[PDB]
Structure 1
Amino acid sequence: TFGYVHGVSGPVVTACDMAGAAMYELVRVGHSELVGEIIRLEGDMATIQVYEETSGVSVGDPVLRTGKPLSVELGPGIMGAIFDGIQRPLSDISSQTQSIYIPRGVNVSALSRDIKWEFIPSKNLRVGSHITGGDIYGIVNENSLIKHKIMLPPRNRGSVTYIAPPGNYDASDVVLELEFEGVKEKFSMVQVWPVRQVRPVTEKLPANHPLLTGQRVLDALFPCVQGGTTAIPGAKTVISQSLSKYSNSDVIIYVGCGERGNEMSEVLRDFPELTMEVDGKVESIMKRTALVANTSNMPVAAREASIYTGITLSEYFRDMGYHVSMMADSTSRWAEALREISGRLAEMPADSGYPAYLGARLASFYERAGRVKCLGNPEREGSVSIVGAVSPPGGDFSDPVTSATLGIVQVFWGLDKKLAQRKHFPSVNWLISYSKYMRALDEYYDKHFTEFVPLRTKAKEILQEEEDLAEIVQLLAETDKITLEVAKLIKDDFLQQNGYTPYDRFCPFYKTVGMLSNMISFYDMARRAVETTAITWSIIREHMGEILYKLSSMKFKDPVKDGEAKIKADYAQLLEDMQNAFRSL
């Protein structure tokens, strides 16, 4: 039925004669058909939060009801496309309107109804049988790299009465008929799934395999795990490119909920040009990747819903028997949006203005990652790795967002106190930097690398010893000097990764192992006494200055042109030079 707007207050819209409306029922507003959703009920008089500016809307305008809550659209062709926070096809919209501006484009389908993909039914199916459902029933015959296999919506299982033959179809036509109950059914290649629900699964299993990244600091101190969860300061975007490039990531999802506009144009320009070369065939990484753009320009609820939309997409592709590596640009801006909307509702706030349920919502966003066993007759597994970003607030440690985040995230890394070098982006804060996956991965490490096992501990020993003695130095034995100069070298070389240069754009784990082994073996045979083993530190420095320069200049060996063998050989030669210097010391 129809309604009438009783009042307007910024992005809020009071209305009347809305008896029977649901809690999150979508609704169109005004003659512009602005999209919104129910928030509060007060009898027939309700309140609606809208997704676009309300300027010009008058009193008494029509209000149309719909029968669905917020939902996303699914099917072929999602990969390789770009979407808004409420799943608008930006590219197709700019194509149709042929104008730079975004009009009030209230009617456009997420996936084109004209492009036809070659559907192929599974051979094991037979028409007119009593299979009683099962998920997989067909497959898109080809895309560039990833075949978009098709499944049956959950909660809907039934016998078979007709299956379409092989052929090209536009996804607007029906290929399934699964009556099974005296009530006929029809399904195309397109599904609708509510965003805020959770797609059920058969089972969840513990982590059983690591995750590889290029960054040395993540790989050595706080390794990540496939199917894992992590948070990283937002002080970086190259990490998404690196994990897609090297790690075993099938599909990539990147979501900018509130990024700056220029950086978002930067990403849009640079991302498609990149390539993968899976097996010598140069293939664009965009083919295995989908985007959800949302700058600060868009209204509040677009930013609110971008995260949930992305998580729904990742879950859907997880069900398809793949591995997905998601990264969110930031969570602080989402929290600010929540603050703004809570203040709009005039619901009384908690500390720092944030609504009390912030922790509950952050829990809802998390606890959806992990390795799982999908729901289906064909057995398969899907992994979801979530990499959130906590942009540094003014109160880094005291931010409620950070406090709630540290109560959930399995593995966390953070920046130390803001150093004099504002460009010290690969820092480390030993106060709060930790991991929770050492137990489930040492068995894997033992079969590949074993030298690092005491070295990782010894590095921490050295760093904490320096941290203890530093304040005393500021306000003096030689061994103290050896410790602090080694720690300074470690911070100057092992940390402070560049990223924007090829020689530190990516680093294989073996390069890290070699350079760290050399850098720490420097200390392992220089701390045995004030001498080489049981002079002073100044004597050691004067004796081995060239050694220190070469230790520093390890970093420049580019993996791109220099293979692993050559860099290993150079490091080993430098180690031999260090040994020669030790013998003459």
Structure 2
Amino acid sequence: STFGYVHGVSGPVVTACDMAGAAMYELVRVGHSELVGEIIRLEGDMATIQVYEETSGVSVGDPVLRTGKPLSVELGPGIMGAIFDGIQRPLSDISSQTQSIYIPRGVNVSALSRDIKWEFIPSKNLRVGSHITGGDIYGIVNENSLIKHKIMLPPRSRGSVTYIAPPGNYDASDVVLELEFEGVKEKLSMVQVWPVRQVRPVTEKLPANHPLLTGQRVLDALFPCVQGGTTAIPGAKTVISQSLSKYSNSDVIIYVGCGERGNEMSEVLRDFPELTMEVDGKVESIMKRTALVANTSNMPVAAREASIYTGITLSEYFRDMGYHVSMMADSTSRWAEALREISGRLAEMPADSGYPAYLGARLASFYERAGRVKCLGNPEREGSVSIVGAVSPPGGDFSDPVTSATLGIVQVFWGLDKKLAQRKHFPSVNWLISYSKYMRALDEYYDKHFTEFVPLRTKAKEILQEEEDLAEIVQLVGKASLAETDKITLEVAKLIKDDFLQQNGYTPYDRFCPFYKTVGMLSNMISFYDMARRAVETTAQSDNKITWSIIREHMGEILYKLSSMKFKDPVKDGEAKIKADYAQLLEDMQNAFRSLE
């Protein structure tokens, strides 16, 4: 039958009966108000339905209308700048149609507007009788000045073209394409529907090999992400989100508030339309190339899960267009707590700290959807999705099961540390706990464009590790054992920690730092370490020693210049000027050392 009846309820879990033919993960409407729910068990003609909306008021014997599709998203024009509920309902259009501050329980606003006119240009290669396959780009929609929305044939669809719309304005209901296979005609509009838990397939999961500049010098030097880079960060988030949203190389951005604090959700939603970037020699709002999935912590447990799978599925859509999507998620821990609550209500056996054992498999089915891809279909193009999933632990402890499962999966991990955050060191990344498995691949790009950088990256982490050794012993011995080279190591480690790794996320001089500035800063600080270390060691067993203090006194101007490198404005001082100034610092540095040699 087309509808069953509610047999029982327990919070956001509803048992139905007379559901005989229903599939697991099939969508359902429950109650006379049509609350959205999804099947999560079957037992004879009974089914258990997870509900995405508050179930208070649902009665035994209420209708249980099943829909023969799993949890799915509308993909098509009108995603850029939109904001969505975790089951894909537009929070802008719910406001606009409801005329009230509340989301109506059971509201059914179409995920992409049926009313807004779109400029569609059919792809000029096509003709009636042309063969097409999933991921073919049969038209461009001018959704924005920034993002050309490539309309794509759905995956699991293929055939011969029987109708193509001429260039013009069309609605999301207009059948802009018709195709045929096996004598079956199929009709397609500018929108496609895709299951959120099913991966969008690809021609080839290519290796990730080009950096993705976060703008934080510590990250982009010592722990870099890559296009397609599967990444995590301890939630502490806003600056990384905003910096990537303004300046990431990624044409498209997605945010996923999975269980976000209602006020921090409003901060993001209010600030993002007002944030702008200078691109193509013009200034534009990041919202013209972003979308957000928003679920405040009080949204029902299932909406917290659906927010992740919708967010990644949107990312995989813009990936298939050939855009290098970057996605952020507010907290994988809140998602895991949603899985914990679902698991508990469903009477499953949890395994550690009350989490389900399948938590690792859930997280993997998110994080492994990242990466560079060769897209499906005929125009050969490469897209990517980068995932920056945040992971706040109960006391900052990285042994917490969400962090442990994440750490077995992610290739990059930016371990933020309470001691740094407390002393207001920003961006608070611990440079001895964090790692990036992408270095192996990225060293090809670095050796093509930045040949000095790999030596500098290695010497930097070495200097910073020798800082921990020297800093620990000073607690007991004070200065008395330290060699003059150990002093030079501590001085340069202080420069690298306080004037390179440190960066103010709110001040325009440090809001974002380009790579040419980043490598030039580090080049100068480590060239100082090498020249100072030489100046000391050249006098080993000699009649007179060039000490750390003799260096520090003669080099005082150069030391002040070195610390000052961070102040160069990337807007008014272009890369040519910054590189030229830093080349003068290198010459000044060499000549200042030459006075002692």
Please give the TM-score of this superposition, normalised by the length of structure 2. 0.91
Shift in Å, 1:129: 5.8
Mean alpha-carbon deviation: is it higher for 527-536 or for 246-255?
527-536
| SS of equivalent residue, structure 2 residue 469 | helix
Pick from 541, 550, 554: which aligns with 2:552?
541
Does the 8 Å CA contact 1:134/1:157 hold for their aligned counterparts?
A: no
Aligned length: 585
User: How big is each residue's C-alpha offset from its partner over 1:54-95, in whole Å with a ceiling of 9 and x where there is no partner?
Assistant: 222333322222221111112211112111111111111111
Whole-angstrom CA distance in 2 between matches of 1:554 and 1:281: 28
Does the 8 Å CA contact 2:222/2:431 hold for their aligned counterparts?
A: no
Whole-angstrom CA distance in 1 between matches of 2:447 and 2:494: 30
Whole-angstrom CA distance in 1 between matches of 2:135 and 2:342: 42
Whole-angstrom CA distance in 2 between matches of 1:543 and 1:420: 35
- Residues 65-84 of structure 1 correspond to what in structure 2 (within 5 A)? 65-84=66-85
Distance 1:436 1:94, change over 3 A: same
Distance 1:122 1:395, change over 3 A: closer
Whole-angstrom CA distance in 1 between matches of 2:149 and 2:420: 48
Mean alpha-carbon deviation: is it higher for 490-499 or for 357-366?
490-499
Whole-angstrom CA distance in 2 between matches of 1:278 and 1:541: 43
Does the 8 Å CA contact 2:432/2:465 hold for their aligned counterparts?
A: no
Give unpaired runs (5+ residues) of structure 2: 477-481, 541-545
Whole-angstrom CA distance in 2 between matches of 1:157 and 1:351: 46
Whole-angstrom CA distance in 1 between matches of 2:88 and 2:564: 48
User: How big is each residue's C-alpha offset from its partner over 1:369-404, in whole Å with a ceiling of 9 and x where there is no partner?
Assistant: 222222212322222222222224325221112122
| SS of equivalent residue, structure 1 residue 203 | coil
Shift in Å, 1:321: 2.4
Shift in Å, 1:530: 4.9
Does the 8 Å CA contact 1:254/1:328 hold for their aligned counterparts?
A: yes
| SS of equivalent residue, structure 1 residue 73 | strand
Shift in Å, 1:313: 0.9
Mean alpha-carbon deviation: is it higher for 146-155 or for 91-100?
146-155
Whole-angstrom CA distance in 1 between matches of 2:528 and 2:140: 57
Matched, 1:577 2:594: no
User: How big is each residue's C-alpha offset from its partner over 1:510-565, in whole Å with a ceiling of 9 and x where there is no partner?
Assistant: 21222222222332222336578436545554555555444333322322333334
Whole-angstrom CA distance in 2 between matches of 1:124 and 1:488: 60
Distance 1:401 1:422, change over 3 A: farther
Shift in Å, 1:197: 0.7
| SS of equivalent residue, structure 1 residue 54 | coil
Distance 1:533 1:211, change over 3 A: farther
Whole-angstrom CA distance in 1 between matches of 2:135 and 2:319: 17
Shift in Å, 1:280: 2.4
Mean alpha-carbon deviation: is it higher for 152-161 or for 531-540?
531-540
Give unpaired runs (5+ residues) of structure 1: none
User: How big is each residue's C-alpha offset from its partner over 1:303-353, in whole Å with a ceiling of 9 and x where there is no partner?
Assistant: 111111011111111112222122222211111111121122221211111
Matched, 1:556 2:573: no
Mean alpha-carbon deviation: is it higher for 500-509 or for 23-32?
23-32
Shift in Å, 1:580: 5.2
Shift in Å, 1:34: 0.8
Does the 8 Å CA contact 1:137/1:150 hold for their aligned counterparts?
A: yes
User: How big is each residue's C-alpha offset from its partner over 1:178-212, in whole Å with a ceiling of 9 and x where there is no partner?
Assistant: 23333332222221111111122222222343333
User: How big is each residue's C-alpha offset from its partner over 1:398-453, in whole Å with a ceiling of 9 and x where there is no partner?
Assistant: 11121222212122221346348342342443553222223323232223222233
Distance 1:556 1:236, change over 3 A: farther
User: How big is each residue's C-alpha offset from its partner over 1:72-120, in whole Å with a ceiling of 9 and x where there is no partner?
Assistant: 1122111121111111111111111211122225221011112222333
Whole-angstrom CA distance in 2 between matches of 1:541 and 1:126: 75
Does the 8 Å CA contact 1:415/1:425 hold for their aligned counterparts?
A: no
Distance 1:126 1:330, change over 3 A: same
Whole-angstrom CA distance in 2 between matches of 1:432 and 1:86: 36
Does the 8 Å CA contact 1:525/1:533 hold for their aligned counterparts?
A: no
Distance 1:571 1:23, change over 3 A: same
Shift in Å, 1:39: 1.2
For 2:517, the equivalent position in structure 1 comes to 511
Please give the TM-score of this superposition, normalised by the length of structure 1. 0.92
User: How big is each residue's C-alpha offset from its partner over 1:12-35, in whole Å with a ceiling of 9 and x where there is no partner?
Assistant: 222323222211121111122111
Does the 8 Å CA contact 1:226/1:385 hold for their aligned counterparts?
A: yes
Percent identical: 100
Does the 8 Å CA contact 2:245/2:253 hold for their aligned counterparts?
A: yes
Does the 8 Å CA contact 2:224/2:438 hold for their aligned counterparts?
A: yes
| SS of equivalent residue, structure 1 residue 156 | coil
| SS of equivalent residue, structure 1 residue 542 | helix
Whole-angstrom CA distance in 2 between matches of 1:574 and 1:380: 43
Whole-angstrom CA distance in 2 between matches of 1:572 and 1:176: 58
| SS of equivalent residue, structure 1 residue 347 | coil
Whole-angstrom CA distance in 1 between matches of 2:301 and 2:29: 17
| SS of equivalent residue, structure 1 residue 80 | coil
| SS of equivalent residue, structure 1 residue 364 | helix
Does the 8 Å CA contact 1:130/1:160 hold for their aligned counterparts?
A: yes
| SS of equivalent residue, structure 2 residue 389 | strand
Does the 8 Å CA contact 1:479/1:529 hold for their aligned counterparts?
A: no
Question: Of Structure 1 and Structure 2, which has the larger fraction of its residues in strand?
Answer: 2
Mean alpha-carbon deviation: is it higher for 294-303 or for 219-228?
219-228
Mean alpha-carbon deviation: is it higher for 232-241 or for 397-406?
232-241
Does the 8 Å CA contact 2:25/2:40 hold for their aligned counterparts?
A: yes
Does the 8 Å CA contact 1:532/1:582 hold for their aligned counterparts?
A: no
Shift in Å, 1:459: 1.9
User: How big is each residue's C-alpha offset from its partner over 1:147-171, in whole Å with a ceiling of 9 and x where there is no partner?
Assistant: 2222222222122333333332212
| SS of equivalent residue, structure 1 residue 102 | coil
Does the 8 Å CA contact 1:133/1:160 hold for their aligned counterparts?
A: no
User: How big is each residue's C-alpha offset from its partner over 1:268-316, in whole Å with a ceiling of 9 and x where there is no partner?
Assistant: 1221123334322333222121111122121111111111101111111
Does the 8 Å CA contact 1:212/1:247 hold for their aligned counterparts?
A: yes
Shift in Å, 1:146: 2.4
Whole-angstrom CA distance in 1 between matches of 2:17 and 2:536: 84
Does the 8 Å CA contact 2:326/2:387 hold for their aligned counterparts?
A: yes
Does the 8 Å CA contact 2:133/2:157 hold for their aligned counterparts?
A: no
| SS of equivalent residue, structure 2 residue 439 | coil
Shift in Å, 1:257: 1.2
Shift in Å, 1:134: 7.3
Distance 1:180 1:15, change over 3 A: closer
Does the 8 Å CA contact 1:133/1:158 hold for their aligned counterparts?
A: no
